[PDB]
Amino acid sequence: EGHLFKRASNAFKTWSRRWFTIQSNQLVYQKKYKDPVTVVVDDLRLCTVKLCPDS
Amino acid sequence: MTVKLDFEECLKDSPRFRASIELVEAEVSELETRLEKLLKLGTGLLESGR
């Protein structure tokens, strides 16, 4: 669990800081503390993770 | 024109949205001129080839 930057629904795709948890083969993100989390990937085991050298 | 836009600024009445919607209507006004010139110029081509 820990803070990561991600791209928001601002028109430029403006980057922004949120607290993320990996659990039960899943990646969620927190919306506010104690309020329920949102899914990022349904299952990480059908995922690929790209180091992305062209960003 | 802007490249790939999303809703926050749009609904919060941002000046960035507002100048960005201004600048695409002008690109579409340019675009239409370039189309009708291409239409008449390719019409003259087709006539010149026939």
Short mmCIF file of N, CA, C and O in Angstrom, two decimals:
data_model
loop_
_atom_site.label_atom_id
_atom_site.label_comp_id
_atom_site.label_asym_id
_atom_site.label_seq_id
_atom_site.Cartn_x
_atom_site.Cartn_y
_atom_site.Cartn_z
N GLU A 1 0.81 -1.23 0.00
CA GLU A 1 0.00 0.00 0.00
C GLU A 1 0.84 1.27 0.00
O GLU A 1 1.88 1.36 0.59
N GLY A 2 0.41 2.36 -0.72
CA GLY A 2 1.19 3.63 -0.81
C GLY A 2 0.79 4.65 -1.93
O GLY A 2 -0.03 4.32 -2.80
N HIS A 3 1.22 5.88 -1.82
CA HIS A 3 0.93 6.94 -2.70
C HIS A 3 1.56 6.72 -4.08
O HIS A 3 2.69 6.19 -4.19
N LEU A 4 0.79 7.04 -5.10
CA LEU A 4 1.16 7.03 -6.56
C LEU A 4 0.50 8.17 -7.21
O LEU A 4 -0.56 8.67 -6.71
N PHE A 5 1.04 8.64 -8.33
CA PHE A 5 0.52 9.70 -9.22
C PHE A 5 -0.16 9.02 -10.36
O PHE A 5 0.29 7.99 -10.85
N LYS A 6 -1.27 9.62 -10.88
CA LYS A 6 -2.06 8.96 -11.88
C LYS A 6 -2.64 10.06 -12.80
O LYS A 6 -2.45 11.22 -12.54
N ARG A 7 -3.33 9.80 -13.93
CA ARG A 7 -3.77 10.86 -14.74
C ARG A 7 -5.25 10.99 -14.50
O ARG A 7 -5.93 9.99 -14.36
N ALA A 8 -5.76 12.26 -14.28
CA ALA A 8 -7.12 12.64 -13.94
C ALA A 8 -7.91 12.98 -15.16
O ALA A 8 -7.45 13.19 -16.24
N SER A 9 -9.23 13.28 -14.98
CA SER A 9 -10.20 13.69 -16.05
C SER A 9 -10.21 15.12 -16.35
O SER A 9 -11.15 15.69 -16.93
N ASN A 10 -9.18 15.90 -15.92
CA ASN A 10 -8.80 17.16 -16.51
C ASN A 10 -8.40 17.02 -17.96
O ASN A 10 -7.95 15.96 -18.34
N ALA A 11 -8.71 18.01 -18.79
CA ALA A 11 -8.59 17.92 -20.25
C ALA A 11 -7.16 17.61 -20.71
O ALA A 11 -6.97 17.11 -21.80
N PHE A 12 -6.09 18.02 -19.99
CA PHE A 12 -4.68 17.84 -20.45
C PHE A 12 -4.23 16.41 -20.05
O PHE A 12 -3.16 15.99 -20.45
N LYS A 13 -5.10 15.79 -19.21
CA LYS A 13 -4.91 14.56 -18.48
C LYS A 13 -4.11 14.76 -17.19
O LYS A 13 -3.33 13.88 -16.82
N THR A 14 -4.28 15.90 -16.53
CA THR A 14 -3.43 16.40 -15.44
C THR A 14 -3.14 15.34 -14.39
O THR A 14 -4.00 14.72 -13.71
N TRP A 15 -1.86 15.14 -14.18
CA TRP A 15 -1.34 14.10 -13.17
C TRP A 15 -1.65 14.47 -11.71
O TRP A 15 -1.79 15.65 -11.34
N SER A 16 -1.83 13.47 -10.84
CA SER A 16 -2.34 13.74 -9.49
C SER A 16 -2.19 12.59 -8.53
O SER A 16 -2.13 11.43 -8.99
N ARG A 17 -1.99 12.86 -7.20
CA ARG A 17 -1.55 11.96 -6.18
C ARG A 17 -2.66 11.24 -5.34
O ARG A 17 -3.64 11.80 -4.82
N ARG A 18 -2.59 9.88 -5.37
CA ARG A 18 -3.61 9.11 -4.64
C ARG A 18 -2.94 7.92 -3.92
O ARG A 18 -1.77 7.57 -4.25
N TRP A 19 -3.61 7.36 -2.92
CA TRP A 19 -3.10 6.27 -2.16
C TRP A 19 -3.64 4.94 -2.66
O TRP A 19 -4.87 4.80 -2.78
N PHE A 20 -2.76 3.98 -3.09
CA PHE A 20 -3.13 2.81 -3.82
C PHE A 20 -2.86 1.54 -2.98
O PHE A 20 -1.88 1.43 -2.34
N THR A 21 -3.72 0.55 -3.08
CA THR A 21 -3.45 -0.75 -2.39
C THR A 21 -3.49 -1.94 -3.39
O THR A 21 -4.42 -2.10 -4.22
N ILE A 22 -2.50 -2.82 -3.27
CA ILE A 22 -2.51 -4.12 -3.98
C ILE A 22 -2.99 -5.16 -2.93
O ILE A 22 -2.46 -5.27 -1.82
N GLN A 23 -4.12 -5.83 -3.28
CA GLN A 23 -4.64 -6.88 -2.41
C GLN A 23 -5.54 -7.87 -3.14
O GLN A 23 -6.34 -7.51 -4.02
N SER A 24 -5.51 -9.13 -2.75
CA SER A 24 -6.22 -10.25 -3.32
C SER A 24 -6.15 -10.34 -4.85
O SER A 24 -7.15 -10.65 -5.52
N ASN A 25 -4.93 -10.13 -5.45
CA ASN A 25 -4.67 -10.13 -6.86
C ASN A 25 -5.45 -9.04 -7.57
O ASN A 25 -5.97 -9.23 -8.65
N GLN A 26 -5.52 -7.81 -7.01
CA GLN A 26 -6.30 -6.69 -7.44
C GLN A 26 -5.52 -5.45 -7.05
O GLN A 26 -4.71 -5.41 -6.14
N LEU A 27 -5.76 -4.32 -7.82
CA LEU A 27 -5.15 -2.93 -7.56
C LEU A 27 -6.31 -2.03 -7.34
O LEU A 27 -7.13 -1.75 -8.26
N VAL A 28 -6.47 -1.44 -6.17
CA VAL A 28 -7.50 -0.43 -5.97
C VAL A 28 -6.88 0.88 -5.66
O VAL A 28 -5.70 0.96 -5.23
N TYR A 29 -7.66 1.93 -5.73
CA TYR A 29 -7.29 3.29 -5.30
C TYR A 29 -8.32 3.96 -4.40
O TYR A 29 -9.54 3.90 -4.61
N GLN A 30 -7.75 4.79 -3.47
CA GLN A 30 -8.62 5.41 -2.45
C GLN A 30 -9.05 6.81 -2.85
O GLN A 30 -8.33 7.64 -3.43
N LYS A 31 -10.35 6.99 -2.56
CA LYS A 31 -11.13 8.16 -3.03
C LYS A 31 -11.13 9.17 -1.89
O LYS A 31 -10.63 10.21 -2.18
N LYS A 32 -11.54 8.79 -0.72
CA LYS A 32 -11.16 9.51 0.60
C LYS A 32 -11.06 8.36 1.65
O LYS A 32 -11.68 7.33 1.63
N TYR A 33 -10.20 8.52 2.73
CA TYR A 33 -10.01 7.55 3.82
C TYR A 33 -11.28 7.12 4.62
O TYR A 33 -12.13 7.99 5.00
N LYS A 34 -11.39 5.81 4.75
CA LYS A 34 -12.62 5.20 5.32
C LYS A 34 -13.79 5.08 4.34
O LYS A 34 -14.56 4.09 4.39
N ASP A 35 -14.01 6.02 3.39
CA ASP A 35 -14.98 5.81 2.32
C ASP A 35 -14.44 4.68 1.40
O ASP A 35 -13.20 4.50 1.28
N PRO A 36 -15.28 3.89 0.77
CA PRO A 36 -14.86 2.78 -0.07
C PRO A 36 -13.95 3.14 -1.28
O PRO A 36 -13.91 4.32 -1.71
N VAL A 37 -13.10 2.21 -1.75
CA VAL A 37 -12.04 2.33 -2.73
C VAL A 37 -12.72 2.03 -4.04
O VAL A 37 -13.87 1.66 -4.16
N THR A 38 -11.98 2.26 -5.12
CA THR A 38 -12.30 2.06 -6.53
C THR A 38 -11.35 1.15 -7.14
O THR A 38 -10.15 1.25 -6.92
N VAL A 39 -11.80 0.24 -7.94
CA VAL A 39 -11.00 -0.60 -8.69
C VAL A 39 -10.14 0.02 -9.83
O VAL A 39 -10.57 0.94 -10.52
N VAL A 40 -8.82 -0.38 -10.01
CA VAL A 40 -7.91 0.08 -11.08
C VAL A 40 -7.71 -0.94 -12.19
O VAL A 40 -7.77 -0.56 -13.36
N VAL A 41 -7.58 -2.23 -11.82
CA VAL A 41 -7.54 -3.46 -12.55
C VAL A 41 -8.40 -4.51 -11.83
O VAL A 41 -8.26 -4.65 -10.62
N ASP A 42 -9.33 -5.21 -12.50
CA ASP A 42 -10.22 -6.17 -11.92
C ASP A 42 -9.41 -7.32 -11.23
O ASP A 42 -9.61 -7.72 -10.10
N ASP A 43 -8.50 -7.96 -11.97
CA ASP A 43 -7.49 -8.91 -11.59
C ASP A 43 -6.12 -8.59 -12.20
O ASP A 43 -5.98 -8.49 -13.43
N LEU A 44 -5.06 -8.44 -11.34
CA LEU A 44 -3.73 -8.16 -11.78
C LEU A 44 -3.14 -9.41 -12.49
O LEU A 44 -2.15 -9.36 -13.25
N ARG A 45 -3.79 -10.54 -12.59
CA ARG A 45 -3.04 -11.66 -13.07
C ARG A 45 -3.25 -11.92 -14.58
O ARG A 45 -2.57 -12.70 -15.27
N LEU A 46 -4.14 -11.05 -15.12
CA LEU A 46 -4.45 -10.93 -16.50
C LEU A 46 -3.88 -9.58 -16.97
O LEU A 46 -4.27 -9.10 -18.02
N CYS A 47 -3.01 -8.91 -16.19
CA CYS A 47 -2.36 -7.65 -16.40
C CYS A 47 -0.94 -7.93 -17.01
O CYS A 47 -0.49 -9.06 -17.15
N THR A 48 -0.36 -6.81 -17.58
CA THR A 48 1.04 -6.60 -18.11
C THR A 48 1.45 -5.28 -17.45
O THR A 48 0.60 -4.45 -17.23
N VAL A 49 2.74 -5.02 -17.23
CA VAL A 49 3.14 -3.82 -16.63
C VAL A 49 4.25 -3.30 -17.36
O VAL A 49 5.36 -3.88 -17.44
N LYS A 50 4.00 -2.18 -17.97
CA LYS A 50 4.82 -1.52 -18.99
C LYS A 50 5.69 -0.47 -18.44
O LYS A 50 5.15 0.51 -17.92
N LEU A 51 7.02 -0.57 -18.59
CA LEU A 51 7.94 0.46 -18.09
C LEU A 51 7.96 1.74 -18.93
O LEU A 51 8.43 2.84 -18.62
N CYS A 52 7.30 1.65 -20.10
CA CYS A 52 6.87 2.87 -20.76
C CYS A 52 7.87 3.95 -21.21
O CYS A 52 7.88 5.07 -20.74
N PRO A 53 8.87 3.61 -22.06
CA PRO A 53 10.07 4.43 -22.24
C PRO A 53 9.85 5.61 -23.20
O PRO A 53 10.70 6.51 -23.40
N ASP A 54 8.71 5.62 -23.82
CA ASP A 54 8.34 6.66 -24.65
C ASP A 54 7.45 7.79 -23.93
O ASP A 54 7.29 8.86 -24.52
N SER A 55 6.93 7.59 -22.73
CA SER A 55 6.42 8.77 -22.00
C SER A 55 7.63 9.64 -21.61
O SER A 55 8.66 9.06 -21.36
N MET B 1 -5.70 22.10 -32.87
CA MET B 1 -6.78 22.02 -31.81
C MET B 1 -6.31 21.24 -30.58
O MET B 1 -5.28 20.59 -30.74
N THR B 2 -7.07 21.24 -29.48
CA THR B 2 -6.69 20.47 -28.28
C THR B 2 -6.71 18.98 -28.68
O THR B 2 -7.37 18.57 -29.60
N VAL B 3 -5.90 18.21 -27.95
CA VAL B 3 -5.76 16.83 -28.15
C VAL B 3 -6.33 16.11 -26.91
O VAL B 3 -6.02 16.42 -25.78
N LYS B 4 -7.26 15.22 -27.15
CA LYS B 4 -7.92 14.45 -26.14
C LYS B 4 -8.38 15.14 -24.77
O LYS B 4 -7.75 14.88 -23.74
N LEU B 5 -9.49 15.90 -24.72
CA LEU B 5 -10.10 16.65 -23.61
C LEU B 5 -11.11 15.92 -22.68
O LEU B 5 -11.93 15.07 -23.12
N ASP B 6 -11.23 16.18 -21.38
CA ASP B 6 -12.11 15.56 -20.50
C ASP B 6 -12.82 16.63 -19.60
O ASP B 6 -12.37 17.76 -19.70
N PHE B 7 -13.86 16.22 -18.82
CA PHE B 7 -14.98 17.00 -18.31
C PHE B 7 -14.76 18.00 -17.19
O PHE B 7 -15.62 18.89 -17.08
N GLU B 8 -13.74 17.97 -16.30
CA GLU B 8 -13.67 18.80 -15.13
C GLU B 8 -13.70 20.32 -15.31
O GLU B 8 -14.43 21.09 -14.66
N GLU B 9 -12.82 20.80 -16.19
CA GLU B 9 -12.73 22.19 -16.48
C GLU B 9 -13.95 22.75 -17.19
O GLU B 9 -14.42 23.81 -16.95
N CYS B 10 -14.51 21.84 -17.95
CA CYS B 10 -15.64 22.08 -18.82
C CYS B 10 -16.94 22.51 -18.03
O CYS B 10 -17.64 23.49 -18.31
N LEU B 11 -17.21 21.75 -16.97
CA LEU B 11 -18.25 21.87 -15.98
C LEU B 11 -17.90 22.81 -14.88
O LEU B 11 -18.79 23.13 -14.12
N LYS B 12 -16.61 23.25 -14.67
CA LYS B 12 -16.27 24.17 -13.56
C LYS B 12 -16.10 25.56 -14.07
O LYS B 12 -15.80 26.48 -13.35
N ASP B 13 -16.44 25.69 -15.36
CA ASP B 13 -16.48 26.87 -16.16
C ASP B 13 -15.04 27.42 -16.33
O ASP B 13 -14.77 28.59 -16.14
N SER B 14 -14.08 26.59 -16.64
CA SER B 14 -12.63 26.99 -16.74
C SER B 14 -12.36 27.96 -17.95
O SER B 14 -12.87 27.77 -19.05
N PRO B 15 -11.42 28.85 -17.83
CA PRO B 15 -11.07 29.77 -18.99
C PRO B 15 -10.29 29.05 -20.10
O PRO B 15 -10.30 29.40 -21.28
N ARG B 16 -9.55 27.99 -19.61
CA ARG B 16 -8.90 26.99 -20.45
C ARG B 16 -9.78 26.21 -21.38
O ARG B 16 -9.38 26.12 -22.53
N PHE B 17 -10.90 25.65 -20.90
CA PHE B 17 -11.98 25.15 -21.70
C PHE B 17 -12.45 26.20 -22.68
O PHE B 17 -12.44 26.00 -23.88
N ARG B 18 -12.88 27.36 -22.12
CA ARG B 18 -13.43 28.49 -22.92
C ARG B 18 -12.52 28.98 -24.12
O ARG B 18 -13.02 29.29 -25.21
N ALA B 19 -11.17 29.09 -23.99
CA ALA B 19 -10.26 29.44 -25.04
C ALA B 19 -10.05 28.25 -25.96
O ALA B 19 -9.93 28.43 -27.15
N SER B 20 -10.05 27.03 -25.45
CA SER B 20 -10.04 25.77 -26.20
C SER B 20 -11.24 25.39 -27.08
O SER B 20 -11.06 24.76 -28.16
N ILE B 21 -12.47 25.74 -26.65
CA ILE B 21 -13.59 25.67 -27.50
C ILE B 21 -13.61 26.82 -28.58
O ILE B 21 -14.09 26.49 -29.67
N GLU B 22 -13.10 27.99 -28.32
CA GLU B 22 -12.85 29.10 -29.26
C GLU B 22 -11.87 28.67 -30.34
O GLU B 22 -12.01 28.97 -31.50
N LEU B 23 -10.82 27.91 -29.96
CA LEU B 23 -9.81 27.74 -30.95
C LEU B 23 -10.13 26.58 -31.98
O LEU B 23 -9.70 26.58 -33.18
N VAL B 24 -10.94 25.62 -31.52
CA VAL B 24 -11.42 24.53 -32.41
C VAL B 24 -12.50 24.99 -33.37
O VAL B 24 -12.62 24.49 -34.54
N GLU B 25 -13.37 25.94 -33.06
CA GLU B 25 -14.35 26.42 -34.02
C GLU B 25 -13.74 27.14 -35.16
O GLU B 25 -14.14 26.96 -36.26
N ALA B 26 -12.64 27.87 -34.83
CA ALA B 26 -11.85 28.44 -35.87
C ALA B 26 -11.08 27.37 -36.73
O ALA B 26 -10.92 27.45 -37.92
N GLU B 27 -10.55 26.32 -36.14
CA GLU B 27 -9.94 25.24 -36.95
C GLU B 27 -10.92 24.52 -37.94
O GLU B 27 -10.66 24.30 -39.11
N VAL B 28 -12.16 24.30 -37.42
CA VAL B 28 -13.26 23.82 -38.26
C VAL B 28 -13.70 24.85 -39.35
O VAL B 28 -13.88 24.41 -40.49
N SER B 29 -13.78 26.16 -39.14
CA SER B 29 -13.93 27.20 -40.16
C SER B 29 -12.76 27.20 -41.23
O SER B 29 -13.03 27.37 -42.42
N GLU B 30 -11.50 27.02 -40.84
CA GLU B 30 -10.41 26.79 -41.73
C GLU B 30 -10.54 25.53 -42.57
O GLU B 30 -10.16 25.42 -43.76
N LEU B 31 -11.01 24.45 -41.91
CA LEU B 31 -11.10 23.11 -42.41
C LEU B 31 -12.07 23.13 -43.57
O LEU B 31 -11.84 22.50 -44.57
N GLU B 32 -13.23 23.81 -43.46
CA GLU B 32 -14.29 23.89 -44.45
C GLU B 32 -13.95 24.61 -45.67
O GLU B 32 -14.21 24.15 -46.78
N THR B 33 -13.18 25.70 -45.59
CA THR B 33 -12.56 26.40 -46.69
C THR B 33 -11.61 25.47 -47.44
O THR B 33 -11.50 25.41 -48.63
N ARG B 34 -10.85 24.69 -46.70
CA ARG B 34 -9.81 23.83 -47.32
C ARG B 34 -10.46 22.68 -48.11
O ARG B 34 -10.14 22.34 -49.25
N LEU B 35 -11.55 22.11 -47.50
CA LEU B 35 -12.48 21.25 -48.23
C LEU B 35 -13.17 21.77 -49.51
O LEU B 35 -13.07 21.14 -50.55
N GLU B 36 -13.75 23.00 -49.45
CA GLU B 36 -14.43 23.53 -50.67
C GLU B 36 -13.40 23.90 -51.67
O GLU B 36 -13.68 23.75 -52.86
N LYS B 37 -12.19 24.38 -51.32
CA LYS B 37 -11.10 24.56 -52.31
C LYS B 37 -10.58 23.24 -52.97
O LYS B 37 -10.45 23.08 -54.18
N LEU B 38 -10.36 22.20 -52.12
CA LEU B 38 -10.12 20.89 -52.62
C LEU B 38 -11.18 20.28 -53.47
O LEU B 38 -10.91 19.70 -54.52
N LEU B 39 -12.46 20.43 -53.08
CA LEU B 39 -13.55 20.08 -53.99
C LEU B 39 -13.48 20.77 -55.33
O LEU B 39 -13.55 20.08 -56.37
N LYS B 40 -13.46 22.15 -55.45
CA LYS B 40 -13.43 22.77 -56.73
C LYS B 40 -12.19 22.49 -57.53
O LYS B 40 -12.33 22.35 -58.71
N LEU B 41 -10.98 22.39 -56.88
CA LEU B 41 -9.72 22.07 -57.52
C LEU B 41 -9.70 20.68 -58.04
O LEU B 41 -9.41 20.47 -59.21
N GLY B 42 -10.17 19.59 -57.25
CA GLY B 42 -10.42 18.25 -57.84
C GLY B 42 -11.53 18.09 -58.86
O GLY B 42 -11.63 17.17 -59.64
N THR B 43 -12.54 18.96 -58.79
CA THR B 43 -13.48 19.02 -59.93
C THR B 43 -12.79 19.46 -61.21
O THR B 43 -12.90 18.71 -62.23
N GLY B 44 -11.92 20.51 -61.23
CA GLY B 44 -11.16 20.96 -62.38
C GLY B 44 -10.14 19.97 -62.83
O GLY B 44 -9.99 19.73 -64.02
N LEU B 45 -9.59 19.22 -61.90
CA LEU B 45 -8.74 18.12 -62.34
C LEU B 45 -9.46 17.06 -63.19
O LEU B 45 -8.90 16.55 -64.20
N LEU B 46 -10.62 16.57 -62.74
CA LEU B 46 -11.41 15.55 -63.34
C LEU B 46 -11.87 15.92 -64.76
O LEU B 46 -11.76 15.21 -65.74
N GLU B 47 -12.29 17.19 -64.94
CA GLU B 47 -12.61 17.90 -66.17
C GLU B 47 -11.37 18.02 -67.04
O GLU B 47 -11.46 17.70 -68.22
N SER B 48 -10.27 18.44 -66.51
CA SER B 48 -9.03 18.47 -67.29
C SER B 48 -8.54 17.10 -67.76
O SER B 48 -8.23 16.93 -68.98
N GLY B 49 -8.60 16.03 -66.86
CA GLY B 49 -8.33 14.65 -67.29
C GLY B 49 -9.37 14.16 -68.35
O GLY B 49 -8.99 13.65 -69.43
N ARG B 50 -10.73 14.39 -68.23
CA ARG B 50 -11.74 13.94 -69.22
C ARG B 50 -11.62 14.65 -70.54
O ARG B 50 -11.81 14.05 -71.60
#
